[PDB]
Structure formats: structure tokens, C-alpha cells
Paper text:
[name] virus ([name]) is the prototypic member of the Arenaviridae family and belongs to the Old World (OW) arenavirus together with Lassa virus (LASV), which are distinct from the New World (NW) arenavirus [e.g. Machupo virus (MACV) and Junin virus (JUNV)]. Arenavirus also encodes a RING finger Z matrix protein as a regulator of RNA synthesis. Previous studies have shown that the arenavirus Z protein forms a species-specific complex with the L protein and inhibits RNA synthesis initiation by impairing the catalytic activity of the L protein, which is known to be essential for the balance of infection and further initiation of virion assembly; however, the mechanism remains unclear.
[name]-L displays a similar architecture to LASV and MACV-L proteins, with r.m.s.d of 1.882 and 2.729 for 1,282 and 1,110 aligned Cα atoms, respectively, which is consistent with their relatively high amino acid similarities. We assigned residues to [name]-L domains as follows: residues 1–190 belong to the endonuclease (endoN) domain; a linker region spans residues 200–259; residues 260–705 belong to a PA-C-like domain; residues 706–1,600 belong to the RdRp core; residues 1,601–1,814 belong to a PB2-like domain, in which residues 1,601–1,727 and 1,799–1,814 belong to the Thumbing ring domain; and residues 1,728–1,798 are a lid domain. The RdRp region is caught in the middle by the PA-like domain, where the PA-C-like region tightly binds to the Thumb domain of the RdRp region and the endoN domain is on the other side. The C-terminal residues 1,815–2,210 cannot be observed in the cryo-EM densities of [name]-L and the L–Z complex, which is similar to that observed in monomeric LASV/MACV-L and L–Z. This portion is supposed to adopt the cap-binding domain that may have a flexible architecture, as observed in influenza virus polymerase.
Author numbering: 1 to 190, 200 to 306, 315 to 355, 370 to 400, 411 to 465, 472 to 506, 524 to 784, 832 to 847, ...
Write the structure that this text describes.
Amino acid sequence: MDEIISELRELCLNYIEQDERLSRQKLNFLGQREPRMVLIEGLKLLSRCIEIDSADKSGCTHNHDDKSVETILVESGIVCPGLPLIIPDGYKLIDNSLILLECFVRSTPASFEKKFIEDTNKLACIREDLAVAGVTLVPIVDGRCDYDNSFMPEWANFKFRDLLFKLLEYSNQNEKVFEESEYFRLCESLMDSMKILKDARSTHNDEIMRMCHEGINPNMSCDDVVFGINSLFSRFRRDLESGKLKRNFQKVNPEGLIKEFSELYENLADSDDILTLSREAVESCPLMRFITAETHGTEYERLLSMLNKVKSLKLLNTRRRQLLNLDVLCLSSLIKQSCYSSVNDRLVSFHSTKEEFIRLLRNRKKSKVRASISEFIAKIQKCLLVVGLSFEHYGLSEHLEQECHIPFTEFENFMKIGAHPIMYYNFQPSTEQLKNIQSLRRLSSVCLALTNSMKTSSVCKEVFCQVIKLDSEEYHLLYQKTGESSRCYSIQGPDGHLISFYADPKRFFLPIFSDEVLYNMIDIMISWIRSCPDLKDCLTDIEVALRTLLLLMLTNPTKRNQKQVQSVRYLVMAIVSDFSSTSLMDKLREDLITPAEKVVYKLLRFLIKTIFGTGEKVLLSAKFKFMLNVSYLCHLITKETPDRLTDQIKCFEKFFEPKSQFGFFVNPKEAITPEEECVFYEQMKRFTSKEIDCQHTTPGVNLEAFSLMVSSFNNGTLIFLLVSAVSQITESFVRKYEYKVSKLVSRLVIGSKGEETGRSEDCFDGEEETSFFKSLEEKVNTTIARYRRGRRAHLQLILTGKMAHLRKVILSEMSAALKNLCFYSEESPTSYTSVGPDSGRLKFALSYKEQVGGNRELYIGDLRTKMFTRLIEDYFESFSSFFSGSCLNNDKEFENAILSMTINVREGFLNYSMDHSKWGPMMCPFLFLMFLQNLKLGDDQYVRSGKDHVSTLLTWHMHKLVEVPFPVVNAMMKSYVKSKLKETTVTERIFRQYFEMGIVPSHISSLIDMGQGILHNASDFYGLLSERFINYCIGVIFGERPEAYTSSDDQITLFDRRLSDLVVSDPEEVLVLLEFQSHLSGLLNKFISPKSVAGRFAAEFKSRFYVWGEEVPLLTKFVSAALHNVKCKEPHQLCETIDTIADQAIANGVPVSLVNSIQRRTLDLLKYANFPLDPFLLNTNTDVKDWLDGSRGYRIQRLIEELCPNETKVVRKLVRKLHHKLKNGEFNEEFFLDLFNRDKKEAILQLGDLLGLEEDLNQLADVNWLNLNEMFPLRMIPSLIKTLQNKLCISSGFIGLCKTLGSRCVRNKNRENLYIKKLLEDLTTDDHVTRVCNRDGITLYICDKQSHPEAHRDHICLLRPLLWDYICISLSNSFELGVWVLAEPKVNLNQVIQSVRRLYPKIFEDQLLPIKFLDLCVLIDINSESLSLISHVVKWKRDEHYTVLFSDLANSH
Ligand SMILES: [Mn+2]
């Protein structure tokens, strides 16, 4: 009591720093005794300590006097009346800028990150107002996770909080009791299943806990279940000869399949059989394949580089014109003394002007200012100002050169200069099969559309002419719109030749230099299909077909062309297979338009008739491999969402359709209203009511078989406005194309959407506030209503608009408040109802993933809910770890799945490679709750609890609130208003109509959700058990138990022999079995998809197909990915990603010769970026299959072992000696002394002298390669340290990598930034330096001992030897992968500890936490900051099984 008060009073002024502001509160704290005053004073002072401590740490003046942002502005004389009311903790005002500090200390990660995000939002809210006011904000907040501060030592404040803690308990004993703010204090600091909350579970968690027991008998005996199965069957079978449907499951006659495929689309694709006819149609389909097959046939051009480099500084209408005189002038002193697209002088910005609008812009810009006297008045000032951007940031020698061309300008020369060159089909030679220059023109008519996002805003014939380079002759483009949007391009040649078409540049990266990879992919393919029936003249037929197909697919990329060629895998899987759904041929049909797509149809049918036509069962394996690969040929299209909005409406629709047929209850409340209880009552009642003849596609579980399942697990047998309307209304008669007006009317979602509170609603609303800016606008609309009456005292929309807007006006007409930013956390769990944890109710939001076929749904929710959901998704994971069938993240189980699959398939037993359908929207947390609160787990107080925590996190998920994404609701309201003002309305367009007759939807909340991926381990658990039960029903009825597996949305069922003899013997039984397994799954929530099969030789478990024995390689699958995945990074890492993906590729059977070609393509891309190819950039382009038994180390060593062939012959026996005498008896530390890494690399000399024989200074000094990251990393502290710290569009990536890597990127010893150009030329021309190439410039072949005026600028200090970086590597490669890496032709914590074993960097590597030779290899890795010798195996997973062509293990070194 009194003793603690006295202790505090004597502790505040005797142990805390004496500050002017702190004293004000210190004295008042000392002057009180009553507990409530003591607490408030102590808490406030504890707040102020951190407040001013962090404000001074930032250096921004603290807001002690509670000065407002407006006050902070006005104390400096800045008058901006009207601003968001904010009270920054620390502020520093300057002439035109502001620094605001918001500070807070939070213990729990969740509350910390929360307060972080809304503090960022609060700062960003006033961003535009601060900017337009003439100042700017310094964005910064002080997120501290501790109380250590300058004003007090740690022990002082720690004991302080202890005393306040104990005095809280004393006060809580007294009548200072606080309802739950007492909790927010105390447990707010004075994972694993937080149970410290109260329990308010009343009158709702009892009905829900009752429906899970009303009807079920979870204890049935061990032989009272058999009698139930035998009476659920044979009550089905006898209702199959008349009742439902013949099983949806029929057999296959391959000819029937092929003919049914052929007769698809009776309408327009109507059996155009003749090959030549099809190809003739093909070569004429779009407008672009009409060129790709057509058979057509430096003083300037550098001045643009200079005229362009000085362009990013300024860009205005008055500019870019006299920036073009400096170019047209250059076009007259080079043709008179003697490109140009015939009226157009290619000006700065890829722009193109008219030679006649110029030469008339002057003479009225110049004349407004004796014209010949007025000559040179601007052509000289421009030179002077551009040269004003001098060696300032290294303005290079290009400057005086222009002083020769430009000053030749005269008004007797600009009388005709543009008047001199006054000059303002093709066909389709089809024989362009197999002609490498028919794709080699795509590989250059895409780079002229790809490097076209690289234009800028830049404000007739104003057309952004790029250049189609090619051998010698060059064409153009002509378009008018930039960005990543669509526009109508053109081409131009020597004759006009408007080959107009319409495409999207983002889609065209795949062929951007790949002319020799595709032509060998499509050539290897046809090396599989050298088959006996086709040896007649059809190989040419197939070859022309396949090439004319790949051309269409690359040349006309679009979603349908992907979904189609993807679906053509199901048909072939069926043709080789032996049963199949009967509703299949409606799983293949699209709405083909755009004759390209129809011709793709015809080509596919031609391929299928040819290969799968007569003479079957002779080489079907090869034909199957061929065709599945042609199926995967779909990946060549980019997976990048053709449009955004029309790919959000689709995702929302795919979410919201089943809810249309079940129930939804738009926009619930935070407190579950009676209506929600009624609707959930009804939905549970229906969900548990599904008779023994199910509607076959609707969510439901039948409480007569569900009882059997739960009871067979519990038994031990299956184991082992008044302003809104007015604002729109006044402007309506103030705004009087009209589609902008339609937008204006559809901007009306303010008198219909005002939901939630929090953050729901996400510019002209504020613009009218500043636009009007009149005297009295914030009171009632009395004046506004007066104008409307006094006014009246493509036009119908205006009158009904006044009718609507007149309609609108008629119908429309204390706690720790300050210490909130301080230790007190406002929100946190407390007493929780059965709906939610009292802070919220498990909010969510959905967006689409990006995939090949169809965009897949994704649920993303804020971090607290992502913390809670982790508890369920881990409890169920640990649960299923006891059962041995699932395979989702149990990776060790996948290998056994593969082994069993192979042992099965090898013999001829079935594989019912099913795939379930609508797995997202046909599962409900209710079902897992039913399944759990009915299981009978063992002894209590350690299982019996945590069950009542999983089964109350689930009950939380039940009532989630997904969000209607804002663009979707905007679009649907547009559609509604368009329809109403002025059919084809899909179902989800009518619900908006009813509700917007009343109130808008915002949130949707229903039982059948199972957020895709959210509970994706709970789903796996359920599926595993259900399959383990159905494969018991089938066992008791028919007589065999077929094993299964699962992924959470895939499956398999490897029936044994006794259920495989029947298909050959009698299919009329196994047909019934595949009907019954498809029926019970219907009773439960498992709906088998029509894409399933039961192939006696085929399989498909998570996309790893099979054939008798071996695996279908899926060549095109991996090639299509390696040719992608080129991301903007450091090229020494961009070429790491590919050297991983190529190892992945050669894991499966991509042949080595295509791998080299992929690598050559990537190197060629870099070389196009103008980036020197130092020998460590991308791996050897001469590879044995040696991707096995070799790390990246071995490739790079092998490269240096041939880029300098006989120098690296001595430094390989020196290393032999070093390794011979390092492991056994010596160095092990003194080698770090001889590493000498502090100083220069004479180490080679002293270390050759140390133990070994003659070694000249040549083999060391001579080979020396330019290295860009020598002294610092280059702009856009070792490497392995950064990686360990890290373990605490794609065609607008390249179009950026080629922009930054050419500019000032490299850095110097004194933070100086240089180009690659000057640095790469000086080493070649301006020294006794020899800089010749070997396919990669190993600059400065000599650098004699580096005896020189060293550090000239940088180009001599900036280049390190080679035969040393060969030594350190060719050592690291000798403990990691054996001894032979010299002879002539493990995990994170470890590495952290052996990094600590030299403790100096641990001081930086430690605080981010909230063997025999490994020391040496870690050292060598830490020094060599370029590749990976250790840090590799901890970033990129290697592969386990390797098989590649046996004709590559024969050509080996
Ligand atoms: Mn599958």
C-alpha cells in the first residue's frame, strides 16, 4: 500500500534523468498518494519518457504542448485553415518540408504491426494536402518493441513497471476494478493456444453444438456398420435400372472419341481436310502471320544517343522542338554533302515529327523574338545549356563533335531542307516451312514491340516509330499509345505497306531472342514420331502442321488458345485410357471466334486423326508422348491475366455461384443478429438433410452414411445523403463524351454504399470541396434545394437525372486516452463470444492467383487472423501426421507414393486417377466441426482441452466475412444503372439488382466456403479419412480394399488384381463400382469431376504422368519455364536463377543441346543489354551432361579451365599440393594468414614460394578480368551473411534491366558512380592494356604485375586476377564434392555458428534473429562475393533422381 507509493515517490526523482518537461509530471506524481492518481501519473510519465526519447532520437522536436498539425503549420506563419486533425509526437518544420514522427511501443507482434499499418495510413492521409500546400512530409514512425530509453536506465524503468504492476493488483483488489481495460493493462506486459481469455459462449454455441449431434449415432457396433453399408447399397443398385443415370461412366471406342471430337461445332469448323488447304488457310488467318511468312528482300545514328541522354531532365511543348532543330540541321550537312522515314526525322524520344511542322514552328517562335540576324539565337543557347549538363555526372566527349554539325545552319539553307525529300500487298509464299528465317523475323518483330513499353508519356504523323533491325534492311513500327495497354501497330517498308494489327506488348517476351531454341524443340519432337504407320508421306504433313501451329500460337496469343491446347491432354489421356466420363465432350468446348482459333481447332483435329488414326497399338507409347507434349505446348503463352477487371469479375463469379443456390446473407453485423441465426439454422438444417438419391451436384452430407463414417472411426476398425445526393445534383446542372457523363451517373455509389465502419469505403468528392470553396457549404442543403426549385421556375438521361436527383433530395430530406500511443494497446483479445474474439469476426478478402488454364481463387487476411488460422491449420497437420495416407507436405510420403504408383503401373492393374471437382465451394467448416466434435479422442485435460479450442476456432471460421472486391461492385453497379436507364444478365447480376433497389452488398458470409488454401490442411485431413472409409465400403461390398492417396485436391486409387481381372472379364460390374464410388462421395461432400479416368496404363498424381514403367518427360513443360523467369536483378543472380532452372530441366529429359541453346539465349539477352561477359556470368556453353555431380562451382571452374587453357595448368597442381598438405598436418589457420586478404594478391607468389616450384609472375598478373562489383555492389558486408540474414510482369522487368545496367551503375571506392562504357573503353584503348575477346572479353590480358600509375581513375584497381579466383574456387570445390575436381580432363544453423567462430560480423548477424573443414569453406565463400560455394545448398534445393539421354553420358569428360 503506502510503502510502494513511497518507493515510487523516492524512485522517480532519484533514478531518472532531470529534464525540463519531465519535471512537470515528476512533481505531480510525487505529490499524490491515492492509488488512482498514482497510476495515472506514473503511466503518463512512462509515456512521456519514450515520447521525448524517441523524438530526440529522430531529432524532431517533441510535441509536448499538444500542438496540432495546423498549429505546427501556423506557428511558422503558414496559413492553411482546414486539415486532418492529427497530433504528431515529433515534428521538425522547414521552409518547404515537414518531418512527422509517430511513436508507439507494442509487445505482441500482431498489435505492433497493426498500429504500424494504420499509423502509415494516417500519415499518408494528409499526403496530398501537405504536398499541394507547398511542403512535403518526411514519412517516418517510431516502431519500438522495448522500453529502453535515454531518460532512464533499464533497471529503473523495469522496477518502475514492476511497482505499477503490483499496485495494479492492489487496486484491482480495491474498487479500482476495470471491466476489461484492467486486462489490457495487466497482460499488456505490466503463442501455443492462448487460453487467457474469458468465455462468453451462450445460446449460440449450443444450437451449433447440437446440430452436430441431432441424428447421428457415433457409436455403432463393429458389425452394425456392415449391415448399414449392405442396405445403403442394393437400395441404390436396384434404383439404377430405372431411376437416376447410367453412372455417367461409359467405355471408349477410340474411333468414337475421334469422330465426336471431329463433329464438334457443327457450325463453321466443318471438316476442311486437305492439308494444303488447311495450311493455305493458316498462312492467311490473322494480319500478322501474313508478314512472318512473306519473303521480302556512323556519324549519325549516334548523335541521337547524346541528344537523348539529356532528355529526362525536362520535357515540355516549348522543348522537344528546338531539341529537334538540332537534329534536322544534322540532316542537311550530311545529305547535301552526299534514317529518314520520308517526311519524318527521328527525334529524341522514339518520337517522329514532320519535317514541315518543324521549319514552321520556327519563323513564328523565332520571328516573334532580321531573321538571318536572328539566326543562331537558339541553336547556340541549346548547345550551351546541354553542355551545361557537362562532366557534371560525366558528360562525355560527345560535345564538341556536335559543334561541327549544328552551326551549319542558315536561312538560305532552311528554305528547302524539308522540301527536298517530299515523299509522304506483299504476298504469302507458303513454302516457309522449316525455313529458319520465318521465326527469325518474329524474334525481331517482337523486340520491336517489346522494347515499346519502354517509351514514355511525351505528351500529322506523331507516331512512336521504333526500329525493326534485322540483317541490313530495317523496317519500322507506327503506333500512337504507350504504356502496357493495347494499340493498333503498323509496319512500314520502302513502299508504305500498312500491315495493321492489334496486339499487347506485354504478351510477346517468349520469342524475344529465341530463334534457335524453338526450331530445335519442334524438331526434336518429330524425332519421337518416326513411326511405322506414318513412314508414308505424312511425316512432312505432320511437320508442316506442327510448325504452322506453333506459329499461330506464338503469333496470336490469347486465353482460349491456351485453354484449348491444354484440354487436348484430357482427350489423349482418354484415348490411351480405358474408361471415361460420359459428359466429357462438354469439358472441351469453348466459344471459338477469331479465325486463328478455329484454325487451331482444325490443326488439332488433323493431328489427332493422323497420329491416332488407323494401325493402332503398334507404337502408341511414342504417339502418346508426342501428343501429351503437344498438349503442354500451351505454356508458351504467358500466364499474365489478359485483362485485370475481366479477370476479377470471373473470379468473383466462380466464388459466388454456389452461394446463389445455397444461401448467403449479404453484409452481416459484428453482433450476430437474429436473422443470421435463423439463416444459419436453416442452412445447417438443409446441409444435414440430403436423401439417398442426391441431386448429385449440391452441397450436402447425408446423416445416414455420415453416421457410419464417424462411428467406424470412433470404433477401432478404420485405423492401421442530405449531402451525397445534393453534391451529385448541383453539378449535374452545372456540367450541362456523354459516356464520361455515364461514368458521372455511375459514380453514384455514395447514396448506395456506406458500409461497415473500420475501413470499407476506399477523388472529386474532396475536389468539389476545394472547387466550390464558397462561404456556407456545410449546413443543411436548404440553399441547394432552393436553387433546384428556382431553376425550372442523347438527352433523356438528363431529364430522368433531374427526376432521380429530385427524388434523392426529397427522400434524403474515461480511459487512457493520451496514453493510447503509449504502452497501452487499445485492441486485443478478451472475453470472446462464439462468433468472434471480441476484436472482430475473422475478416478476409479475395483476389485471383495467376495460372495457365484458369485464374484460381486466393483468400488473404490481415495478420491477426492469419495468426489464429495458423492454430487450426497446424493442429490438423499434427493430427494427420499420425495417419499414413496423405501427401501434401509430408514430402517423404511422396517418394513412397511414386514407388507404389510405379510398382502398380508396371503390371497392369487399374489406376483410378480421379480428380475431385469444385473442392473449394463444396466444403464448409461446419463439416470439419461435425467431424471433430463427434470423434472420441482419449484421456482428458490434455486432449479434452485444445479440442475445445480447435472446435472454437472453427466456429469462428464459420462466420467469416469475405469482401466483395471494389472494382467488381463498381462494375456491377455500372451494369445495373446502364440497364435501368435504357437481356443477358447472368445470375450474379440480378442479386445486385434486388439489393441495390435497397442496400449495396459489401460482405458475404455463408457456411459453404472453406477458403481456398486457408484451411488447406483441415481439408486434407478430412479427405484422407473419407477416402480411407470409402475404400472400406467398397472393400466390404465387392471384396477388395483398394489403397488411395491424397493431396487435398487430387487422388488416386490403385485397385489390386481382383478388381482388375473384371474389366477384361466383365466391365458390367466395374462400371457399377465406379458408379458407387462416385455416389457415396456424392453423399458426403466429394464430387468426382468428369476429367477422371481409370487408365490401365496411365496415371496423373499432382502432374507427374506415367506410361508403362518410365515417366513422360514433359520437355515442353520445363523449356517453357526456363525461357521465362528472367527477372530484373544483378546479372550475377539473374544468371543464377537460370543455372538452377536448367538443372531442374536436365533433371527430366530435356536434352543437353537444347539446354546449351537456352543458356546461349540468356547470354545473348545480356549481351544485347551491353553488359560485359566476365567469365563468372553464365555457365559454360559447352556442357557434357555434367549437371549431375557438379555444383555451380564445377561449371564456373570448367569455364575458367578453357577460357585460359594452359595458365590454369600450374595453378591446378599448386592447389593439388595445398590440398595434399592442408587436411593432414598443417595450416588450418595459418592459411588465413597466407590468405593475406587485407592486402594485395601477391599471395599467389608467396604461396607458390611457400611449398612449391617455379611460378612466374605471368600466370598470375596476366589473366585479370574486369569485375564490376569489386569495391561495392552496383545500384538498382559479404554475401553469405546477407543470405543468412534473409533466413530470419516479366517483359517490363527486362525492359528495365536494359535501362539501368547501361546507365551509371558501378560504384567507386569513394561512393563515385561510373558508366560501363567509359570504364570498358579505357581498359581497351588508353593504356598498355590488351583487351581482346574469346566470346567474352577477358580485358587487360596482361596488366604487368599491376606495375603502373595504379588507380588511374578506376579501371586498374577495379579488376582482379583470374588464376587466383580459380585457386580459391578450385579449392572450395575440393572438400565439397571430392578430390577429382583437380585432376586433368550442412544447414542454416551450422553456417551461422561457423560464421560466429570469427565473432566480428556476429555483432551484425545476431540481432536479426528476432564440422571438420566447414570453417575453411565458409571463409573461402565469404571472401568470394560473387558465386556460391556453401550458401547455395541453403537457397536452392537440389534434385534427387536423375535420368537423361544415354547419348549424353557417352560424350563425357
Ligand atoms: Mn490430377
